Write a protein that binds this ligand. Structure first.
Ligand SMILES: Nc1nc2c(ncn2[C@@H]2O[C@H](COP(=O)(O)OP(=O)(O)OP(=O)(O)O)[C@@H](O)[C@H]2O)c(=O)[nH]1
Ligand SMILES: Nc1nc2c(ncn2[C@@H]2O[C@H](COP(=O)(O)OP(=O)(O)OP(=O)(O)O)[C@@H](O)[C@H]2O)c(=O)[nH]1
Ligand SMILES: Nc1nc2c(ncn2[C@@H]2O[C@H](COP(=O)(O)OP(=O)(O)O)[C@@H](O)[C@H]2O)c(=O)[nH]1
Ligand SMILES: Nc1nc2c(ncn2[C@@H]2O[C@H](COP(=O)(O)OP(=O)(O)O)[C@@H](O)[C@H]2O)c(=O)[nH]1
Ligand SMILES: [Mg+2]
Ligand SMILES: [Mg+2]
Lengths: 54, 427, 31, 52, 430, 436, 440
């Protein structure tokens, strides 16, 4: 159990979530949520373009 | 070994149940068709706590899905994880509850409860030792609030010495979507005070508050609220599914929780919740978990804990951590503020420690707090109830189903004496 | 929100700026 | 109409001192703990209901 | 010839035994599979069969499976006979009544049968070693019933208690004053000597003596296992002065109600600090009486010693012991009672303590395990009594105990007994 | 081991704090993202005084950012060190204070302060052994003065034995910014007297005169005066973070410079300041540092010390130097100017030396001066307040917010009590017993 | 068999003990790692380190010292420095927050926390002492830790050990320079509480050592290490009899009997005679007469008190190196004939001598020259009443207005202790007067 008492343990430790998608962001971790709308501005811009042509 | 038969009644109940069962299938490594594809041998150990086994190596949930109209269970059947439930346990009615408690408790749920009791008996006696059941519903609806209480009552006169859990969702005055729900909430909390062993009061207002100020979600839907509820639903029963340095099953969080039989209304809370942009400024240590876990905004009930005295607090930690870190943080919390904790109990915090964390996570913990600040979740609903009942506002929809007006009077009287019960330890 | 500039160096003082009267005069005697 | 030398001295002449809280240092780094709550000094032996 | 039947009750008992039997198997030449790659010093703990397997004389008891199943799937699975590791179905869930009146009766018969089948192999059975915790449900309830049943069929056989006291400041449970009051009221006539350790005191010891900040329960288990191995070291290794297991009760327990001595392991230092320190007999016996080295969080200076039984290991020369205890008898800090002019029981062994790979303690040549019966434990009984009187005044948590067939008068007749115990602790210091 | 929780309120406080954190991060070797990148080892040993540990070698500061207008938070995030601050510590309001002390103290800063106190208590109880707090604000502003006074009043009643330093910015005689500056200035001094331990008065015109005379800057901006302010904040706490021959923390300066509890208004000054054209004309010696330090044209408050008496003087030195030279220079500056030091205190100089100079710097020194010439700074504010309050100049923007007319009276009553107390201690017979 | 426990308290104590222990290691053969470079004898080797160093089983010598401070930044330099391996880790005690120039922090609130840890470490170090003589305490009169906690240490040691000898190495306040404002308050309080819990109190100034380093030594702009090396040389010459051969041995108990005439006057001044640079030593013969006369020079004194303003009461002289006792006899016979050196009638002897054959050691980096003779003179003179009167006046000026007393009254110390500490030293003022008048 040197890992629980390592003074530089926080130095070698990685964040809970690094990017918008990687491996250890799965629904039992409560780190990635579907309600966060990535590709939300693009949907609004596309819908505005549809309204413009119409 | 120690099996849990999971029940759910209502739309809200079935949408929370889908999230919960997919979360448990995530934890135990179950694909959307039923089989196992995980990478650790620890996930098969107590997999029969929630699952059964069929031929061909198929794991099916021990779930009973109850509703009074077929569209909601058609919706959960066609979802991403609707192919894992055995279609026998899907029980529906034809005419809906109509957002009416009397309909679900006397008229349409009572003529459905026999088949559901048959299914409950068939699924709940295959197990060797049954720890207890589990219900997910809301008090603001009609079929979860009405027939769910009937279900609790009939599985209480038949299984007296088991564990009853209800992850009820009581309504909020600020976020209200039905004009009748004071009646339903009052008439259901009349039953939940003596038919249940633990009760977890969750508010939609508190979930929206979490999603707005903590998670910083742009568009929180009902799916994220069910995700946040199922987080704590999985967190409370993690020590009888996985090993730990200090195990604590469901019964240990009842003897060490309620000091008197009428005080079992808790409020959950999940500790490691972080926004997307605030992820790299976070250190995943025990003090950071316990100072976030005790925060007033992190409660999943909309009552401020700082208005009342804490009765007893749980903390079921998951992950690999040292023990006196937890034992000194829970002592620091009681020592810093001695006016928010009751004085006639010397230690008000129970520690539970598991080993296996949530998937892809270094460390996690959950909160179960019994407090005298929960009375303001009942004072508001009782005040709205007596605002409606003094003019007999919507009572023709209920008295026509065959219930007397004495029932509302005894329901509000028992809500009042529950409030006065929670008041005498506030001073 | 991107980083605006490369932050000109300003290094430490060469000979002093790192010795604190105990790194100096309290080394190995080694005359 | 006040002499601020007479009263600044009278505020320390007609006063009482602030009694410190008993604290013991346990380790050589300087960790400090409260003395009364930790079971070192005799506190609960002097309770009124001892042995009765 | 000199057998010792160990009994482990509860999660605390099983996790303590997981370190104790690690130390025992490494002490002799016993592999994890039970074989030995011949001396017969292992009969204090191991019984040999026809297939060349050394089976421990232990009965791992719990009412919950998933703490015993790690013995069944871990690295010491081949060592243990299947009937030794005994599990129930439902845990007591921090309830004394559940482990004493409802769930304990189903397992007490099977545990008694395994105890009897283990005692047929003992020609020279010395005593039973019991490991449990006061705060738990199984370890406080079923262990007390185990004493109540073991005291009838055997009687005068020695029984040794290795209990975990409730900590002063921290506490992992809520109803643990109730569990403690009941298992202390009912074990009083059914325990010859009750060795006391405390989790927070060992927490401080590994914080300030060793440099391991944040130990887990495993380090505490290793320290307790070192104490237990030093206690029964004379039965297996040659010694200048041999100490039998029935000498502790005669030289440590003045009165039958007062059988709660303390624990202290002297040279518990790290490998960084052993470089600058010589570890002679006088230094370790002086570090024994320092209150910073006690395994119960209390100050012995605020009380009077009743007796002292103190053991030695390794290259220990008896005149250094002589002068070293003669120094302690001249210190005004240390005080004894009127009616004990003798004070000390001395034992010397030759086997140095055994190191474990990846352990905390350093390899030393001398060691002392001091067992002190002191009046300073009376601050613990008064404080536990106050913590009860906070809760029992408003009848908190009683309804979870009257359900399992215990009347309301049991709490009152427990409180009467330990009020009398506090009176006995005061009235003998006069 | 001795941590300092930083606070900053208002636009002046946030613009000062940005430069202060830039200078501290340059001293300790922190990149604009957060990761430590230093060369020596002293820069990491005492990093926890101002910083917190996060994952991966990234350090998050101890600061709490408070304001009522989100534009200032927008500007403080757009700086070269805007990414190092934790996003949770940003606390903003929606409607600005309107340059009103009453609004920011009673109406808009009342409900907002609960979240700020939440951040403060969250971030102060996670400390090994907290020393105290700091605050940068301007008394002439609206949210700065009012909400800073409210923050200090709420903080002192929860941690009543810590160190509460304020690097306040006092208003201006000559060139001011706002019309209603005297009201906020006279209403903020009441709270700072009773609720602060040390108060540093920094005047903008003194900084402007420094930049125009000593530095010859063509276009001095706010980011130019804030460098001098950041230097005198960083020079005070240099004994905590680096080893020294003679160490003096905030509490030692507290003990040495405050003879009576109500007299804690000081006068900063930074020693090695020299323009670009005259940089090669100076030999860097200790007499040069102590000659510039005690100069009347080097203080950061627009009040010369020849018009008053020096009650107590500090001199915190940085760099490798000789103690005999420093002590003899303090002796010479005490004995040459005899009438400018009070005679009922025999030695008025507290000395401190730290052997680590700032990054790029070789030697440096910081002047903390408790003088009785600070009373004339309050005299002008009192005269302007009496000119305004005699005819209700702008009272309807204060009294309509809930404040009382009598609340403006106790303000200048206590302010002039402080002025009279400084005056009485200015002319006191040293060889005199007294009534007692 | 001659062990003495050095107790360094405060920043001054720790920084003095650094140079002291460097010179202790260099004088014997002990490396900075605590090991001898080799074992040249088969089984012999000198045990002369037993005065200062305790040998473990294998090969390592550990100092018999306790380093106490209330601030981590002074001990942490030793903890990560060159002599890190030499010191036992538990021998360096460190608080979290310092006293900060306040006697009350070191005496009532903060210094009363770590006092138990220091007392148990002192007991543990005294357990290995076979022939313990006494304690040596290094502190300063002007600080908060070195004034309050050192007084608390004397307070506890008198209770726990009785009549055991405890010598002081104080840093007296200077008459014109100082590095604090509240220095007179600390000086009066910690003199008042330790007027009787100290058997002897050797004091040196800081301005006087500055003057000696400027004038006698060739160096200008000195640092604190140059003062600490001289103080280490003084404390080595005091304890040189316990470790080296001597024609006349001077025990640590002899100082209090041959230097303290009366139960409160125990403040002698120290001086080191041949403190000269290398090129000044090249042109100068340093015979016993020259270095005996140089001790009595007013400029060569290490405390800023003119000996011509008072009367000598007792003198203790410690000699080192190539010293003939015949020349010591002649040189002390010459001094008694002088008129500029005046003694008191009731002490016709006035001299205690001690000769040690060990020459002083040369620490590399120091500015002192290699000399064959050295004298460390400890003189108790009545001329210190100038210094007590100036300290009296400096306390007086601040106490007239009751400046800075809110920092002291608000921390458990009442106002009355000022009124009795000042009254007790005002008694001591004329206590010095009563022993300076001649009986006719
Ligand atoms: N010192 C120490 N105490 C332990 C250890 N493991 C468990 N405990 C103690 O065990 C007590 C609670 O009992 P449990 O561990 O749950 O074991 P139990 O007696 O079977 O109790 P139940 O599981 O509820 O039946 C706590 O007070 C812990 O302090 C250990 O490894 N070291
Ligand atoms: N000779 C000598 N004197 C020193 C040294 N360091 C400090 N002093 C003296 O010590 C006095 C102040 O006390 P410090 O040693 O700095 O600190 P302290 O004694 O621990 O007191 P606090 O800082 O309040 O804890 C000053 O007046 C100096 O004269 C040193 O290295 N050598
Ligand atoms: N948490 C959560 N609550 C829901 C969801 N859908 C509905 N509700 C709540 O349920 C209450 C009405 O119950 P309803 O959905 O009709 O369920 P039913 O009456 O039992 O069928 C409302 O107050 C909603 O806030 C959901 O997906 N999640
Ligand atoms: N010296 C100096 N003064 C400043 C700085 N920033 C703002 N100020 C002064 O602060 C005053 C305005 O106060 P401000 O903080 O903007 O008002 P608030 O935002 O309501 O608190 C003006 O008189 C400015 O001169 C700065 O960086 N340096
Ligand atoms: Mg158990
Ligand atoms: Mg100091």
């Amino acid at each position: 159990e040197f890992d629980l008492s390592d003074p530089l343990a926080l130095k070698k430790d990685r964040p809970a979530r690094q990017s918008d998608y990687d491996a250890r962001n799965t629904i039992s971790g409560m780190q990635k949520f579907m309600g966060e709308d990535l590709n939300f501005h693009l949907r609004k811009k596309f819908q505005e373009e549809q309204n413009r042509e119409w | 070994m120690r099996e849990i038969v999971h029940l759910q009644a209502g739309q809200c109940g079935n949408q929370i149940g889908a999230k919960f069962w997919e979360v448990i299938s995530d934890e135990h490594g179950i694909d959307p068709t039923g089989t196992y594809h995980g990478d650790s041998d620890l996930q098969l150990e107590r997999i029969n706590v929630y699952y059964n086994e069929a031929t061909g190596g198929k794991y099916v949930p021990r779930a009973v899905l109850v509703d009074l109209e077929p569209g909601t269970m058609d919706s959960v059947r066609s979802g991403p994880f609707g192919q894992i439930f055995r279609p026998d346990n899907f029980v529906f009615g034809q005419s809906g509850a109509g957002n009416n408690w009397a309909k679900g408790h006397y008229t349409e749920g009572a003529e459905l409860v026999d088949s559901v009791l048959d299914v409950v008996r068939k699924e709940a006696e295959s197990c060797d030792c049954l720890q207890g059941f589990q219900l997910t519903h809301s008090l603001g609806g009609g079929t979860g609030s009405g027939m769910g209480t009937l279900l609790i009552s009939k599985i209480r006169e038949e299984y007296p010495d088991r564990i009853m859990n209800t992850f009820s969702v009581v309504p909020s005055p600020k976020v209200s979507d039905t004009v009748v729900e004071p009646y339903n909430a009052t008439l259901s909390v009349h039953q939940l005070v003596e038919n249940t062993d633990e009760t977890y009061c969750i508010d939609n207002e508190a979930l929206y508050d979490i999603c707005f100020r903590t998670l910083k979600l742009t568009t929180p839907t009902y799916g994220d609220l069910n995700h946040l509820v199922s987080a704590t639903m999985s967190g409370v029963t993690t020590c009888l599914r996985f090993p730990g340095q200090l195990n604590a099953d469901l019964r240990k969080l009842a003897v060490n929780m309620v000091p008197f039989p009428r005080l079992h209304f808790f409020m959950p809370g999940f500790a490691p919740l972080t926004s997307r942009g605030s992820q790299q400024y976070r250190a995943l240590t025990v003090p950071e978990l316990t100072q976030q876990m005790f925060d007033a905004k992190n409660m999943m009930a909309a009552c401020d804990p700082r208005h009342g005295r804490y009765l007893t607090v749980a903390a079921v930690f998951r992950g690999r951590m040292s023990m006196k870190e937890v034992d000194e943080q829970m002592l620091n919390v009681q020592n810093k503020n001695s006016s928010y904790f009751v004085e006639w109990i010397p230690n008000n915090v129970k520690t539970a420690v598991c080993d296996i964390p949530p998937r892809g996570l270094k460390m996690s913990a959950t909160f179960i707090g019994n407090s005298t600040a929960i009375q303001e979740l009942f004072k508001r609903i009782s005040e709205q109830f007596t605002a409606m009942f003094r003019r007999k506002a919507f009572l023709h929809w209920y008295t026509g189903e065959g219930m007397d007006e004495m029932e509302f009077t005894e329901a509000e009287s028992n809500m009042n004496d529950l409030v006065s019960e929670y008041q005498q330890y506030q001073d | 929100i991107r980083l605006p500039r490369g932050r000109p160096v300003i290094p430490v003082v060469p000979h002093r700026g790192a010795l604190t009267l105990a790194q100096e005069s309290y080394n190995l005697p080694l005359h | 109409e006040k002499n601020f030398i007479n009263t600044n001295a009278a505020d320390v002449i007609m006063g009482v001192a602030k009694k410190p809280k008993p604290i013991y240092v346990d380790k050589r780094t300087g960790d400090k703990h409260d003395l009364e709550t930790s079971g070192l000094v005799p506190k609960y032996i002097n309770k009124k209901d001892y042995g009765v | 010839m000199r057998e010792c039947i160990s009994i482990h009750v509860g999660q605390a008992g099983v996790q303590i035994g997981n370190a104790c039997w690690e130390l025992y198997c490494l002490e002799h030449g016993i592999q994890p599979d039970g074989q030995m790659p011949g001396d017969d010093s292992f009969n204090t703990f191991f019984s040999e069969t026809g297939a060349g397997k050394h089976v421990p004389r232990a009965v791992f008891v719990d009412l919950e499976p998933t703490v015993v199943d790690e013995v069944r799937t871990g690295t010491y699975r081949q060592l243990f006979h299947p009937e030794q590791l005994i599990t129930g179905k439902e845990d007591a869930a921090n309830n004394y009544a559940r482990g004493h009146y409802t769930i304990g009766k189903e397992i007490v018969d099977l545990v008694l049968d395994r105890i009897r089948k283990l005692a047929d192999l003992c020609t020279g059975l010395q005593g039973f070693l019991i490991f449990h915790s006061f705060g738990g449900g199984t370890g406080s309830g079923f262990a007390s019933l185990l004493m109540e049943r073991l005291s009838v069929d055997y009687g005068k056989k020695s029984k040794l208690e290795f209990a975990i006291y409730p900590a002063p400041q921290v506490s992992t449970a809520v109803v643990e004053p109730y569990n403690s009051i009941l298992t202390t009221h009912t074990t009083l006539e059914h325990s010859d000597c009750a060795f006391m350790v405390d989790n927070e005191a060992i927490y401080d010891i590994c914080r300030r003596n060793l440099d391991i900040e944040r130990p887990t329960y495993t380090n505490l288990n290793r320290l307790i296992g070192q104490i237990v191995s030093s206690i029964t070291a004379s039965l297996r290794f040659d010694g200048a002065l041999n100490v039998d297991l029935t000498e502790f009760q005669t030289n440590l327990v003045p009165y039958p109600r007062i059988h709660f001595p303390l624990a202290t392991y002297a040279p518990v230092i790290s490998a960084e600090k052993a470089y600058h320190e010589q570890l002679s007999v006088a230094e370790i016996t002086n570090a024994c009486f320092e209150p910073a080295n006690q395994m119960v969080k209390c100050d012995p200076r605020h009380g009077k010693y009743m007796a002292c039984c103190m053991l030695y290991r390794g290259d220990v020369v008896p005149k250094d012991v002589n002068a070293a205890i003669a120094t302690i008898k001249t210190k005004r800090t240390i005080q004894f009672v009127d009616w004990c002019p003798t004070g000390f029981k001395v034992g010397i062994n030759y086997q140095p303590p055994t190191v474990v790979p990846g352990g905390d303690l350093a390899k030393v040549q001398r060691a002392v395990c001091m067992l002190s019966n002191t009046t300073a434990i009376a601050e613990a009984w008064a404080r536990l009594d106050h913590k009860l009187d906070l809760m029992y005044a408003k009848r908190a948590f009683v309804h979870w105990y009257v359900g399992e067939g215990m009347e309301e008068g049991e709490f009152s007749e427990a409180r009467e007994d330990l009020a009398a115990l506090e009176k006995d602790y005061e009235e003998v210091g006069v």
